[PDB]
Amino acid sequence: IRLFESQIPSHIKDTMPWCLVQLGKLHFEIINYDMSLKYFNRLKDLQPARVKDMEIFSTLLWHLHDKVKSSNLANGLMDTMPNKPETWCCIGNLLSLQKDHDAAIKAFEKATQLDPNFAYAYTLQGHEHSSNDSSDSAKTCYRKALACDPQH
């Protein structure tokens, strides 16, 4: 973040979508929730129909309980690409945000079926399975999550 502040010009910083994504993910990692949202909104302003890595935003907006923006983003993402796994995991995150979670598990497993090498879908599945007061399924899901991404 200090390197952004010093070694990155402001005009490049507030214009590059990739720098915005990296900066938002970084501020997520420091658990700076307010900072990340007002730049991810700028990212959506730059291009609404971009998927890349929307898992971070889905995780953020689940915490902030913004049901309407999440609904809009999920609708737009599906209308753009149905086969990208991040879109399906965002939908499952919204569904878990609402209330029902069995269909969220099913959506997550389908998203993992679209691309077996997506570790964040596995780890989101495992984190969700804790809410199902079930541990063995959660434990197996966590193990298969860590299998996909060694450093997670």
């Binding site: 658990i31 995780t59 689940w62 915490h63 995150n93 989101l124 984190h127």
Partner: peptide, 27 residues
């Protein structure tokens, strides 16, 4: 056991039943 119901009923429902015994996050 529910041997009889009110006003000479036939069957019986059971709305609730419970048993009692003694003894922030990252997504």
């Amino acid at each position: 056991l529910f041997p009889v119901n009110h006003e000479n009923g036939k069957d019986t429902h059971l709305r609730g039943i419970r048993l009692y015994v003694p003894s922030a996050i990252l997504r």
